[PDB]
Amino acid sequence: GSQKERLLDELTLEGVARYMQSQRCRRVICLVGAGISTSAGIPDFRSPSTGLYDNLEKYHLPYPEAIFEISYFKKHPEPFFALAKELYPGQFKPTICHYFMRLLKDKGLLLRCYTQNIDTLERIAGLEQEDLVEAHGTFYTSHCVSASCRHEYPLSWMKEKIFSEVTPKCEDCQSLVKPDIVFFGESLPARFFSCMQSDFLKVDLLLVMGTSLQVQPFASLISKAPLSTPRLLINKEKAGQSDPFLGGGMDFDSKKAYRDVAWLGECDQGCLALAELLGWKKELEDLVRREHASIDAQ
């Protein structure tokens, strides 16, 4: 129920690892964001210096957030597509942290991965539609915005549009073709909610990686878990703690902290370190090396 038991023998990465290899822990949900794709060459939003929010004056823009709002995008779709060309990676290579989640899947521990990212790196690492909630959509597909025809286009088609700097318009009806991402101001995909109502009824561990937990309703997921579900954050910086002035969230440090753990560093390093404790380090090394080699050969 709502009893706040202490399931981890100690609020550390080693405590989480022993819990992951006990019998109580059979369903794991990952919540991930842009931090886990920065070492794949896709920059943050809010990280000072790197993050996009510091790097977008050049966009004739009245509000550094407007380039991701649906309202602004309806009026002026060009800056987004211009920004999309800048950021489009030359090669899609998922990170160690991505591959840690594919290890979760391969070992039957992955109940679901909820991602805020739209870069398709979860799928390239081998997470299937049954494993994934792309909470903010994806670049992988695109649709005519006209309610009358909503023709679908593949990333191959959208990429050439963006690289040829020509605004994507629909071959059937000449309306705008928008990548299948959830802009700020749009409604999250239905499957987000149907998964959320069911997944969080029996998750045994939350793995929060590479997200500042500042976009809603995604950030609210950490509170859907039952009160005794251990929660591990792997992130550059602590996140998800209740504001002192503002049901609340992460509790790493207070006297009544009992299940939240913050491993601070690179998501790739933190997943490397967790895998070591689990005896998966070599297993993780071969998988990343093999898949990077396969991708490097394309």
Partner: peptide, 6 residues
Amino acid sequence: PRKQLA
């Protein structure tokens, strides 16, 4: 509910 910053 919709995608919103905070």
